[PDB]
Write a protein that binds this ligand. Structure first.
Ligand SMILES: [Ca+2]
Length: 98
């Protein structure tokens, strides 16, 4: 956009979240969590540069606890898609994504 994004750029839709939840389930979370290493290993399958994925991890791990639940995973998946589409990552997690 002319404005660096639209109403829909950083928001996660119901459909997107349903897809993310399916992918999260495929990782066999334990009591709703995957480890940081598990998450980052999965993300590496996107093709994105490691430095980029490191930034995405830090954005998505909202509570800074080093592990990842379903909400955080959805956020990471949205950021990965945006980066693949050629958007720049934000310096902090957009509130609309939470
Ligand atoms: Ca976390």
């Amino acid at each position: 956009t002319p404005f660096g994004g639209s109403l829909d750029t950083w928001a996660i839709t119901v459909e997107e979240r349903a897809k993310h939840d399916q992918q999260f389930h495929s990782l066999k979370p334990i009591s709703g969590f995957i480890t940081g290493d598990q998450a980052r290993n999965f993300f590496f399958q996107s093709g994105l540069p490691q430095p980029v994925l490191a930034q995405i991890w830090a954005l998505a791990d909202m509570n800074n606890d080093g592990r990842m639940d379903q909400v955080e995973f959805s956020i990471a998946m949205k950021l990965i898609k945006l980066k693949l589409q050629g958007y720049q990552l934000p310096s902090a997690l957009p509130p609309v994504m939470k």
